[PDB]
Coordinates of C-alpha atoms and ligand atoms in Angstrom, one line a residue:
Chain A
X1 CA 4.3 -32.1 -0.6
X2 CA 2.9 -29.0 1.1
X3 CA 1.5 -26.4 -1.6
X4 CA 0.4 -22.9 -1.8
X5 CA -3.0 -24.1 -3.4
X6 CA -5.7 -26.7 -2.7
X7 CA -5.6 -29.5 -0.1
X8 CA -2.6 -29.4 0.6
X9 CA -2.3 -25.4 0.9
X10 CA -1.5 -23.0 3.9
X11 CA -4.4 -24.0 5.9
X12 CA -3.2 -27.6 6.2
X13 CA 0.0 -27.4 6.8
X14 CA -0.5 -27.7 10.9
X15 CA -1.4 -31.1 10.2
X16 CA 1.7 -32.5 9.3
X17 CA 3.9 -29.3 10.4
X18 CA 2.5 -28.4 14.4
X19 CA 4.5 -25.1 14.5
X20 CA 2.8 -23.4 11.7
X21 CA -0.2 -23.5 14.1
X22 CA 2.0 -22.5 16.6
X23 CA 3.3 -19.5 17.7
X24 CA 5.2 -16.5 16.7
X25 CA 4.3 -17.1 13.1
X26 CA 5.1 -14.8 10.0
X27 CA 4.5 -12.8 8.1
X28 CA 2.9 -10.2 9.4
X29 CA 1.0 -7.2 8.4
X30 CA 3.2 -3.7 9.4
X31 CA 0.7 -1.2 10.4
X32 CA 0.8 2.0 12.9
X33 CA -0.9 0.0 16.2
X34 CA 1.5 -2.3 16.4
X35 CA 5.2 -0.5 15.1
X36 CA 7.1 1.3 18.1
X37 CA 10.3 3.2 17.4
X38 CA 13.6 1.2 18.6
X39 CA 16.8 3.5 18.8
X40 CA 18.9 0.8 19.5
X41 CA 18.8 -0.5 16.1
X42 CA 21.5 0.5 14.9
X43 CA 22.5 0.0 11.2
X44 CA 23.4 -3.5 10.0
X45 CA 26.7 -4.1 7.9
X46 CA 26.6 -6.4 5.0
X47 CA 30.3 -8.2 4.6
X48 CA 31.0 -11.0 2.2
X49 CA 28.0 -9.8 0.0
X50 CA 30.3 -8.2 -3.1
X51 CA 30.5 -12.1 -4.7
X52 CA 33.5 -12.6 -7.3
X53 CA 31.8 -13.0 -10.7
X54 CA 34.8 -15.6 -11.7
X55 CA 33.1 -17.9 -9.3
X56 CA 29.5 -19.5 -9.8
X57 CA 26.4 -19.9 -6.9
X58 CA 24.1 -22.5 -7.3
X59 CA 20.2 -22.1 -8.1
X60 CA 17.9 -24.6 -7.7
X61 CA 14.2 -25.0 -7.7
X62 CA 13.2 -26.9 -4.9
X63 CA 9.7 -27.3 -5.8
X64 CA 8.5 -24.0 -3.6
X65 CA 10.8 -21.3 -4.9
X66 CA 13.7 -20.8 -6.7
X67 CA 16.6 -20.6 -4.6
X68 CA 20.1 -19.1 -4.5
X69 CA 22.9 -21.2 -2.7
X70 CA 25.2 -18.3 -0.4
X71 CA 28.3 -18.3 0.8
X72 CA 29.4 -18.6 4.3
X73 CA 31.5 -15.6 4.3
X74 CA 28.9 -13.7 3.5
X75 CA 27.5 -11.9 6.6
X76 CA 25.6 -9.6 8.7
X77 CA 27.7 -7.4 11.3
X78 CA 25.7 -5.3 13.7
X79 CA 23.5 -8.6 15.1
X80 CA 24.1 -10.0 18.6
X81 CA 25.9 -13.1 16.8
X82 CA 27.6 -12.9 13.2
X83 CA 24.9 -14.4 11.2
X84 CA 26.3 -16.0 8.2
X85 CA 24.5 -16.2 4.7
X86 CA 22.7 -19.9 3.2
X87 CA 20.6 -19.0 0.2
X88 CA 18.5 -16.0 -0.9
X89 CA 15.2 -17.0 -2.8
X90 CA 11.9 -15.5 -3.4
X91 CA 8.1 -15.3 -3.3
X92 CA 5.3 -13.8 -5.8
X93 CA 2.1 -14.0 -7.5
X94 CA 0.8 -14.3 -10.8
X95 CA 0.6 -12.8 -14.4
X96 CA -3.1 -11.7 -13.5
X97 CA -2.5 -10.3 -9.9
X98 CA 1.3 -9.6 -9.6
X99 CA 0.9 -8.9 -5.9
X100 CA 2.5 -11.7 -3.8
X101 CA 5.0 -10.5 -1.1
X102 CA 4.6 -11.7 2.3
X103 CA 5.0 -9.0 4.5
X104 CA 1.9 -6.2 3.6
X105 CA 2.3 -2.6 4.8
X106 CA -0.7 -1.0 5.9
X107 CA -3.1 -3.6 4.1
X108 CA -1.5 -3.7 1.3
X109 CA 0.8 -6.2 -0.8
X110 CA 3.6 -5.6 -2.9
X111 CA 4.3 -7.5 -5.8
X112 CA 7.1 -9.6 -4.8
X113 CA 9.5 -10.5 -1.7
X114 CA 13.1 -11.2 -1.6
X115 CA 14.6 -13.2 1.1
X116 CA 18.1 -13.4 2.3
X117 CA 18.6 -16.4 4.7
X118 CA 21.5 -16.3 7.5
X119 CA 22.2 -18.7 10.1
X120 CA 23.9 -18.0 13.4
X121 CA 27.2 -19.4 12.7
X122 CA 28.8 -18.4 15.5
X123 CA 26.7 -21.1 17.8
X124 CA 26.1 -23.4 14.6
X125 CA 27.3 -25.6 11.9
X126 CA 24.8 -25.1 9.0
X127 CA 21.3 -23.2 8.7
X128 CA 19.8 -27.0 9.0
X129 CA 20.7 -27.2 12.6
X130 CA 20.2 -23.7 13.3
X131 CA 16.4 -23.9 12.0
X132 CA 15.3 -25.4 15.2
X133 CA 17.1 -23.5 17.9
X134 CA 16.4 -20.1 19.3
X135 CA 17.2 -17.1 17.5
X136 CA 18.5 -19.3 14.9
X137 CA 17.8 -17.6 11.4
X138 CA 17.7 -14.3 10.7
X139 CA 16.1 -13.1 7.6
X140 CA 16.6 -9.9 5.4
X141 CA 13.3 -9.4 3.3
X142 CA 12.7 -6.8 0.2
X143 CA 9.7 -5.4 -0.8
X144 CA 9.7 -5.7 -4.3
X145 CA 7.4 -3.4 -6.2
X146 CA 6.4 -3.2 -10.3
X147 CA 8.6 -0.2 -11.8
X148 CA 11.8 -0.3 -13.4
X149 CA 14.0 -2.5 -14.9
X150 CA 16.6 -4.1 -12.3
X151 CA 19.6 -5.2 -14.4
X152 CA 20.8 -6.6 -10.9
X153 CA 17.8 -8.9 -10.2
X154 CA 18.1 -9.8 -13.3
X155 CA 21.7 -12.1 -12.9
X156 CA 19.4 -14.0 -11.3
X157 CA 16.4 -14.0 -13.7
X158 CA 18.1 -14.4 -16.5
X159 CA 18.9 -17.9 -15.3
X160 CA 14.8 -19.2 -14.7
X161 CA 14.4 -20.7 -17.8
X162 CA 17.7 -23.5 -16.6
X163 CA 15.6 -24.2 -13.5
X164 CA 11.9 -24.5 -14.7
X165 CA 11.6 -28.0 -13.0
X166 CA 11.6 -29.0 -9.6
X167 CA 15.0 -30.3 -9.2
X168 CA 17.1 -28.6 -11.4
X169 CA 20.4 -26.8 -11.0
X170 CA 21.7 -23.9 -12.6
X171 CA 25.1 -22.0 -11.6
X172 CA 24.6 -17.8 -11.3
X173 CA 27.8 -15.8 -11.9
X174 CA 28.7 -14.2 -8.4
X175 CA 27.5 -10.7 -8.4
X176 CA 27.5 -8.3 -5.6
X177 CA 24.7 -9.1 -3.3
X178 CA 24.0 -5.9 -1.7
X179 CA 22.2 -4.4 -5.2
X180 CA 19.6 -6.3 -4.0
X181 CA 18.8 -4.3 -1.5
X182 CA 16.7 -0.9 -1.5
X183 CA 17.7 2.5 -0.2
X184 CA 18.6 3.5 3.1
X185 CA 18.7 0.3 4.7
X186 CA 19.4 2.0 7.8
X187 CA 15.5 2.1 7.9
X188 CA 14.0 -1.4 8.8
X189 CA 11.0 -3.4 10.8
X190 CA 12.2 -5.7 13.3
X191 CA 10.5 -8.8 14.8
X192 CA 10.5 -11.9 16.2
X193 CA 8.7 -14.7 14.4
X194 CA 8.8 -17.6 11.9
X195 CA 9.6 -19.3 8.7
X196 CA 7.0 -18.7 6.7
X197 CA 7.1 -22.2 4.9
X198 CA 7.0 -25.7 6.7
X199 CA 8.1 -26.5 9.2
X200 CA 7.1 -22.8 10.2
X201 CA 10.0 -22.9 12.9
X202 CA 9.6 -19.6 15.2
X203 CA 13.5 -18.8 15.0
X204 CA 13.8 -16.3 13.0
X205 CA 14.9 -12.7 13.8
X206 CA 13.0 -10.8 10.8
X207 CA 14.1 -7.9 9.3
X208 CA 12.1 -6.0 6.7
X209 CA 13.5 -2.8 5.0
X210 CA 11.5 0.1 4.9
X211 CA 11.8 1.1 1.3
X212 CA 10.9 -1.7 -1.6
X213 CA 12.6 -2.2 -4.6
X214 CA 11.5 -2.2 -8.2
X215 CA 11.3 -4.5 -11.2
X216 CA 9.9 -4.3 -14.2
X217 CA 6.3 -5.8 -15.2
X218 CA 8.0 -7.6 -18.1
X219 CA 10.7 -9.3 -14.7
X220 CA 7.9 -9.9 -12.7
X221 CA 6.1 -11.8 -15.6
X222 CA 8.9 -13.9 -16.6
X223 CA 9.3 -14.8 -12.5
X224 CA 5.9 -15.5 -12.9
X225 CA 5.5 -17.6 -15.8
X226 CA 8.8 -19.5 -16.0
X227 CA 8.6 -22.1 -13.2
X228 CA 7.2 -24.9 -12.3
X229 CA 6.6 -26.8 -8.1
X230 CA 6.9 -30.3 -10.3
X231 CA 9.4 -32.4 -11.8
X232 CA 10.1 -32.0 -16.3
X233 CA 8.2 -35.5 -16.3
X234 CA 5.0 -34.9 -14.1
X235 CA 2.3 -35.9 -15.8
X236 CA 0.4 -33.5 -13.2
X237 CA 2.2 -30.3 -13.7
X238 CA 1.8 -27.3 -11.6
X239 CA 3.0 -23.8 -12.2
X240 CA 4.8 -21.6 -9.3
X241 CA 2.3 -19.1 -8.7
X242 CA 1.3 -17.1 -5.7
X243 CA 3.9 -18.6 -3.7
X244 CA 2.7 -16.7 -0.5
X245 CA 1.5 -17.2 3.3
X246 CA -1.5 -15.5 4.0
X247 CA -0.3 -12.7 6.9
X248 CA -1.0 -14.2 10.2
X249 CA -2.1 -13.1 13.7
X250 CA 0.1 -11.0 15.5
X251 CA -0.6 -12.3 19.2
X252 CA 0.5 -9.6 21.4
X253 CA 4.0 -9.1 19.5
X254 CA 5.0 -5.2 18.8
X255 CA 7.2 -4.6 15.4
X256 CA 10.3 -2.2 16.4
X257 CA 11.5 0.1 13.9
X258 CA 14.6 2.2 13.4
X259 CA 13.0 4.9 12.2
X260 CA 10.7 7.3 14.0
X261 CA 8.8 8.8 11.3
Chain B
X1 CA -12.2 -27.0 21.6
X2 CA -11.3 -24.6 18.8
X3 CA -10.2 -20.6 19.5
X4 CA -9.0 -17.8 17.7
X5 CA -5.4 -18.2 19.6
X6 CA -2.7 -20.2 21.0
X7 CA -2.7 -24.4 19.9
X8 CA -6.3 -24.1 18.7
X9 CA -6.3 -21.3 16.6
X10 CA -7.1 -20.7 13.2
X11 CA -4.2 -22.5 11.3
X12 CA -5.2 -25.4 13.0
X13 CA -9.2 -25.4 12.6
X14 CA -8.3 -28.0 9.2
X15 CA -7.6 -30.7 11.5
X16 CA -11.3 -31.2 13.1
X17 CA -12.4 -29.1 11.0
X18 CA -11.8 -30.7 6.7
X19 CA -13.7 -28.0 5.1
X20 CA -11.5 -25.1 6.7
X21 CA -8.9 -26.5 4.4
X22 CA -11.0 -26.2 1.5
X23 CA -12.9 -24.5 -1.3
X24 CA -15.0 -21.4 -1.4
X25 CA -13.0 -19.8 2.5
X26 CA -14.3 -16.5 3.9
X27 CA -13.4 -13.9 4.8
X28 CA -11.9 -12.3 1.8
X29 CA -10.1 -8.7 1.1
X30 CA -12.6 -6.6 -1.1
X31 CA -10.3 -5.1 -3.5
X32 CA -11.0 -3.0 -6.8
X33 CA -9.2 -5.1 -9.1
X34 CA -11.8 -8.4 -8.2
X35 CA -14.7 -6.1 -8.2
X36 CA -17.7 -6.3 -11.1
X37 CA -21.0 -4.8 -11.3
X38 CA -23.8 -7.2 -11.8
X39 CA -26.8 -5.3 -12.4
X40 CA -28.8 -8.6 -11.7
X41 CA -28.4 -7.3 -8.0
X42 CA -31.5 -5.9 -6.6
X43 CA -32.1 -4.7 -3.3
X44 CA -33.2 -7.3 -0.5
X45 CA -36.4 -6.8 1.5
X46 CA -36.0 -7.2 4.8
X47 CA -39.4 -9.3 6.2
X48 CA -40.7 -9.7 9.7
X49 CA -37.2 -7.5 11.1
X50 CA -39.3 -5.2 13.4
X51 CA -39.2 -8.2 16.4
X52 CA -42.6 -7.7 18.6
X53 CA -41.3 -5.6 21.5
X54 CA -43.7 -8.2 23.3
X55 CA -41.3 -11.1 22.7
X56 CA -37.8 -11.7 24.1
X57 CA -35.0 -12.7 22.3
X58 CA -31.9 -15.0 24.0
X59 CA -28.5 -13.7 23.7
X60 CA -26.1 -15.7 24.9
X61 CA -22.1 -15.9 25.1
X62 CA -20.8 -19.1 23.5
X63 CA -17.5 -18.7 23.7
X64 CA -16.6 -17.5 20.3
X65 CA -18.5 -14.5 20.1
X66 CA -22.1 -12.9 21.6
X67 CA -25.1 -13.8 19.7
X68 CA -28.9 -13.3 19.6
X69 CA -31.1 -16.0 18.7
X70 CA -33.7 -14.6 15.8
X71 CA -36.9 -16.1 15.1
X72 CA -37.7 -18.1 11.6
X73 CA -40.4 -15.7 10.4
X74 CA -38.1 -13.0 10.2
X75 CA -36.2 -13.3 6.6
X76 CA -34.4 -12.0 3.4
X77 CA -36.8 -11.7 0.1
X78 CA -35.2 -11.3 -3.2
X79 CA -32.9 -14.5 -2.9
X80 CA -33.6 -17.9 -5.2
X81 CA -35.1 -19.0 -2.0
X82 CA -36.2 -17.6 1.5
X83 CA -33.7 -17.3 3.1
X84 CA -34.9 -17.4 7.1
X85 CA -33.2 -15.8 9.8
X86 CA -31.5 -18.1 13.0
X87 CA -29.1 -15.6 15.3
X88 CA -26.7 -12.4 14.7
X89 CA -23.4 -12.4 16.2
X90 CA -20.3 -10.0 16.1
X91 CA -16.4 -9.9 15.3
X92 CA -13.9 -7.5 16.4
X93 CA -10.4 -6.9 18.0
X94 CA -8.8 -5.2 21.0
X95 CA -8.6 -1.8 22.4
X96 CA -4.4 -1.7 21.7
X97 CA -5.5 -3.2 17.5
X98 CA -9.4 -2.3 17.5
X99 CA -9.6 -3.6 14.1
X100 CA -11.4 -6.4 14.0
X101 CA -13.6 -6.9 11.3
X102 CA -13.5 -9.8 9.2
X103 CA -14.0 -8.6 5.5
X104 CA -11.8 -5.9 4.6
X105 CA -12.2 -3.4 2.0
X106 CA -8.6 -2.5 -0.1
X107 CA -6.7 -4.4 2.6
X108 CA -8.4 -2.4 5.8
X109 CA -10.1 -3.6 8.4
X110 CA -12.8 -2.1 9.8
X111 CA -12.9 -1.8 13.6
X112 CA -16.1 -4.9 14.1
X113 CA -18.5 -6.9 12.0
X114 CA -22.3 -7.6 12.6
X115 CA -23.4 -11.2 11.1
X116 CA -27.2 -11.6 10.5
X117 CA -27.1 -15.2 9.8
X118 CA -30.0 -17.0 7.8
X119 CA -30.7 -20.3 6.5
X120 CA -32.8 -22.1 3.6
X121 CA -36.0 -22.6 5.1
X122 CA -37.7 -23.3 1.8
X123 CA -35.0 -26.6 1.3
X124 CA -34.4 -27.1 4.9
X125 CA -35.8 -27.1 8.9
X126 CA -33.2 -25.6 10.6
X127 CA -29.9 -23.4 9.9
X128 CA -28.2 -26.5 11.8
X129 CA -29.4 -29.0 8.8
X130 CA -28.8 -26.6 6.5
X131 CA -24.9 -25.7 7.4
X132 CA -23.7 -28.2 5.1
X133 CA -26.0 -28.6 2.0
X134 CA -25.9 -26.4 -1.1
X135 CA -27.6 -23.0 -1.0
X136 CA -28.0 -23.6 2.9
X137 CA -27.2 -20.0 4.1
X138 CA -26.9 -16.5 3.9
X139 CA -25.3 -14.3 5.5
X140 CA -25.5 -10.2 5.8
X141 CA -22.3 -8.5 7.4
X142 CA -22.6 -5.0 8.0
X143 CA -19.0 -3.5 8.6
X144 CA -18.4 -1.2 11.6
X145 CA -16.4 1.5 12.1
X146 CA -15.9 4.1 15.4
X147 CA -17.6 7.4 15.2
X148 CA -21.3 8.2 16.4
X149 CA -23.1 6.7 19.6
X150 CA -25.4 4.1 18.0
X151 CA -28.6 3.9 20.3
X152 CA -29.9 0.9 17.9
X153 CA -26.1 -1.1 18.9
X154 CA -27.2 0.2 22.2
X155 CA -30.2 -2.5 22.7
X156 CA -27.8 -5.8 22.4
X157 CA -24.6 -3.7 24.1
X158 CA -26.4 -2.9 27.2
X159 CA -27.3 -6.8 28.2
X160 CA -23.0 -7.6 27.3
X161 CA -22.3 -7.6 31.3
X162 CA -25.1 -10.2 31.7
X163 CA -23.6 -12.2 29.0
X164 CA -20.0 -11.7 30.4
X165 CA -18.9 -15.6 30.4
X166 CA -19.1 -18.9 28.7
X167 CA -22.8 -20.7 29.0
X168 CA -24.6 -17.2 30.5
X169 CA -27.9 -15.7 29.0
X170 CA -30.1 -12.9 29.1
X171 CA -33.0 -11.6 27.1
X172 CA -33.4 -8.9 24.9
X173 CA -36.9 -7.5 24.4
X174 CA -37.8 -7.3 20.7
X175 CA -36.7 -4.5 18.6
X176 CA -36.4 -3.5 14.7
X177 CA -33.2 -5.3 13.4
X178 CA -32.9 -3.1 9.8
X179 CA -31.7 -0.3 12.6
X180 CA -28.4 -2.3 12.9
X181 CA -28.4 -2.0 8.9
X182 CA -26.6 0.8 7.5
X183 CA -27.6 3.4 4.8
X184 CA -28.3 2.9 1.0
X185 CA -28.4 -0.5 1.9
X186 CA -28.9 -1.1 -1.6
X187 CA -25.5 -0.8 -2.5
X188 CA -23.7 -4.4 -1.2
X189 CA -21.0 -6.7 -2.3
X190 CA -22.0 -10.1 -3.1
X191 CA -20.3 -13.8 -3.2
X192 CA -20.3 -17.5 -2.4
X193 CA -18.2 -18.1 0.5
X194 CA -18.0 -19.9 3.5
X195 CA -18.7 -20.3 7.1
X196 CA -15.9 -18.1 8.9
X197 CA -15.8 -20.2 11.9
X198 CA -15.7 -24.0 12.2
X199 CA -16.5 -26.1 10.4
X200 CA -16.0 -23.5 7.8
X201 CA -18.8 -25.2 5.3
X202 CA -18.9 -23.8 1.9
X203 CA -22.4 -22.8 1.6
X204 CA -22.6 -19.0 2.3
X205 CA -24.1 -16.6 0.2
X206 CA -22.4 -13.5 1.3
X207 CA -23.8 -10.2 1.2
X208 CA -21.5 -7.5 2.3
X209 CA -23.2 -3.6 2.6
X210 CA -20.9 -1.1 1.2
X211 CA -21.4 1.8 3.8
X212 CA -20.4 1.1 7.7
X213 CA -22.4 2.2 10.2
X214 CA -20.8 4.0 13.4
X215 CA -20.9 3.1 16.9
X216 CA -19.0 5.6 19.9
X217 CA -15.7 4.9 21.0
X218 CA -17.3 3.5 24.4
X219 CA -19.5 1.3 22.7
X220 CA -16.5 -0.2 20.8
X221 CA -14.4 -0.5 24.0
X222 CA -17.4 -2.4 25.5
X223 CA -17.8 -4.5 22.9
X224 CA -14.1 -5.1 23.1
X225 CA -13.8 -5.3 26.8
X226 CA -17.0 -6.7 28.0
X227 CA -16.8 -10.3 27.6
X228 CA -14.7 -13.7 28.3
X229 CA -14.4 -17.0 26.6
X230 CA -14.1 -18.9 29.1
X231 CA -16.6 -20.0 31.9
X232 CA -16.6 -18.1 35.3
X233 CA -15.3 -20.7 37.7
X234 CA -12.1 -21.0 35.2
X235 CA -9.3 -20.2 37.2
X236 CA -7.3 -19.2 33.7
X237 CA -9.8 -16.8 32.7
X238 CA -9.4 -15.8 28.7
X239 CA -10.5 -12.5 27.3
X240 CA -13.1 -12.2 23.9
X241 CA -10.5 -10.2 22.0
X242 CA -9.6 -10.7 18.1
X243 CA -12.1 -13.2 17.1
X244 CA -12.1 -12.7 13.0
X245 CA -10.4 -15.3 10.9
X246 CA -7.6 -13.8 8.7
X247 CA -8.3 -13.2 4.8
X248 CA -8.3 -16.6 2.6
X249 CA -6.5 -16.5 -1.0
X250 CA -9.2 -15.8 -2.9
X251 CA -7.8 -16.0 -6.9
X252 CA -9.5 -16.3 -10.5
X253 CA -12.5 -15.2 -9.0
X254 CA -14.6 -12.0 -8.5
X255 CA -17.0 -10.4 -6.4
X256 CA -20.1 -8.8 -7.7
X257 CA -21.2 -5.2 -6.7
X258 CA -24.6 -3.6 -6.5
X259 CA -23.1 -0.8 -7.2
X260 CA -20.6 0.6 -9.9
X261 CA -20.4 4.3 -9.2
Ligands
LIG301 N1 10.6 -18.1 3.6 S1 11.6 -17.9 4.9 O1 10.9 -17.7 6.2 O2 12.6 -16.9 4.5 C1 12.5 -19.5 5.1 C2 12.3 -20.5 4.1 C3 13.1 -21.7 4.1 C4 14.1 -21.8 5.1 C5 14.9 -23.0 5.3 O3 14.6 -24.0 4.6 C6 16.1 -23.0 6.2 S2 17.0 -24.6 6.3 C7 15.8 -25.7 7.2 N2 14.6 -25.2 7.8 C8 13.8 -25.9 8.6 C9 14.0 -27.3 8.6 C10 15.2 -27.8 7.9 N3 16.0 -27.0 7.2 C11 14.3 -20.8 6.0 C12 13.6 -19.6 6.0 CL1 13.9 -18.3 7.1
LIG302 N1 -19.3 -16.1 11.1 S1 -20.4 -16.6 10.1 O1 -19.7 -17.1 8.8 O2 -21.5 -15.5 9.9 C1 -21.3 -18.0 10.7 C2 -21.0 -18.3 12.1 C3 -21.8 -19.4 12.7 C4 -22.9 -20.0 12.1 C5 -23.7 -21.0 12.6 O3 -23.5 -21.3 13.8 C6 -24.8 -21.7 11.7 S2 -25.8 -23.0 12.7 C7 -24.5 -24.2 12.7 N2 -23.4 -24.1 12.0 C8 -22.5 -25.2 11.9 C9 -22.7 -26.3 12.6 C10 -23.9 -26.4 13.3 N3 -24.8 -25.4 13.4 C11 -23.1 -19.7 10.7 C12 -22.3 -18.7 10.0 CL1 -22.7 -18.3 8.5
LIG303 ZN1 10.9 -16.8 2.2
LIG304 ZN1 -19.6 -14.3 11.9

């Protein structure tokens, strides 16, 4: 029953969740005094992510996001561990401020982030058990910024108004994963932190590409408008808006990049 | 006993702490997009600032940050009330991140922030009373960024090694307190907010100056390097480094300018 809003919003959640006061938590703020250049990360390999479209994923809206169920063929090679795919969902902000990724660069927010969630499968059965154990989860994030259209976001957009209501299920034709992802993903941010919901686990391996995304103003609007944290028959309803954490203190951690310059 | 890091840190202020979970949280980003002129906003007078050189002033280290007691004749004019002055105090960072204000402006920090804090004497005794009643206090931050030597900074810097740890004192000898103001002071940012330390009371009126005054790069490493939270017998000493809350969501609401151009 956490929220992104009120008394029950980001600055409570230590009270029922101890690890989002704890440490190691994301996101973060990238900026110059705390990025150092890495040259041993080396390029990761996305395997598994070209998903047949005669087969169907499901999306659900779990009263936080909307989410996208993964298959566990789907992979990352190039890790320390083959970390195999769960779900991919997302976070944003509103018609009047469209500006609601987690990660900010320099300061600054971009409209929207994309998360792809992968568990080490090699030491685990599910992402459930991995959640809690070290090095766990490893996350691709995008940086999604207002532009142009993005037919392949939109497989998954064009399915929002199927799961306004927390609870519902839709099924997404398979499509190929990677056209999520931005140029030159040879170019990332790498660090150690959190999730960035409750429970706020610090297990995750974050990686954040260099270059956003785009999407239009008239995708980020229907993201924006077409969803709801609450059930069709709330008599309370609340809209899915500014879905965010607040960037958080980055206690002595450095951010290692692949790229120099 | 609540700190700016580790198991006490800011996430988890909400627990002792109710109102850090609630309404009306400072600090905020000062972005274009929530600014409006008000011409309404007139300049402040500053009254009874130029302390008698005859009398001295206690500065102490608290733990949280260094701070000079002020005396109650000293006070804002051009408020709905007087608003009388109780202590200044300062937030900043560390030498390897020395960005440490507390506002930002377009998502940047500035390297420190000065807080002249003052309370309703006209509704109540004390600033202590006044903490938690409507219209209790206002604050002025000044923002401040590296560049000149600051001889005015100079009169509290120079009395930091005799404030090094928790529960010390020294005096300061009066001096004129518009010299830590900056130029065209004038031109500010104004809004209600909140205390930005616990118990995080709702019942600031903030008045942020648009211009930053400088300080030299030694002064800033002083500032940074100079002091400890902790008490000097503490055989896990703890350095005053990064003591500024992170940025609150602050949504469907503006802040008023002095200024437009
Ligand atoms: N926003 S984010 O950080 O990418 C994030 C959000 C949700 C989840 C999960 O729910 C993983 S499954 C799980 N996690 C903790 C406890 C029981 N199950 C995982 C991640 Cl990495
Ligand atoms: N960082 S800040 O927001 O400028 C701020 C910091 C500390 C204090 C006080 O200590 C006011 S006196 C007091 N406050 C709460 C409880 C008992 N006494 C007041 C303000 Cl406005
Ligand atoms: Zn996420
Ligand atoms: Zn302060």
């Amino acid at each position: 029953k956490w929220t992104y809003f009120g008394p029950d919003g980001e600055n409570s959640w230590s009270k029922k969740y101890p690890s989002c006061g704890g440490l190691l938590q994301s996101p973060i703020d990238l900026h110059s005094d705390i990025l150092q250049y890495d040259a041993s990360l080396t390029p990761l390999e996305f395997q598994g992510y070209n998903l047949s479209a005669n087969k169907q994923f499901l999306l659900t809206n779990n009263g936080h996001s909307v989410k996208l169920n993964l298959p566990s063929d789907m992979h990352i090679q190039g890790l320390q561990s083959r970390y195999s795919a769960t779900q991919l969902h997302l976070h944003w902000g509103n018609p009047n401020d469209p500006h609601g990724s987690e990660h900010t660069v320099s300061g600054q927010h971009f409209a929207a982030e994309l998360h792809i969630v992968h568990y080490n499968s090699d030491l685990y059965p599910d992402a459930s058990t991995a959640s809690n154990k070290s090095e766990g989860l490893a996350v691709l994030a995008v940086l999604i910024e207002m532009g142009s259209f993005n037919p392949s976001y939109d497989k998954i957009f064009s399915h929002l108004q199927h799961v306004k209501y927390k609870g519902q299920e839709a099924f997404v034709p398979g499509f190929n994963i990677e056209e999520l992802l931005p140029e030159r993903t040879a170019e990332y941010y790498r660090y150690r932190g959190s999730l960035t919901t409750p429970p706020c686990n610090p297990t995750v391996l974050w990686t954040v590409f260099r270059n956003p995304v785009q999407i239009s103003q008239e995708q980020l609007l229907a993201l924006e408008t077409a969803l709801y944290c609450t059930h069709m028959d709330d008599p309370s309803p609340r809209e899915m808006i500014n879905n965010f954490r607040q960037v958080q203190k980055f206690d002595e951690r450095l951010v290692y990049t692949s790229f120099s310059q």
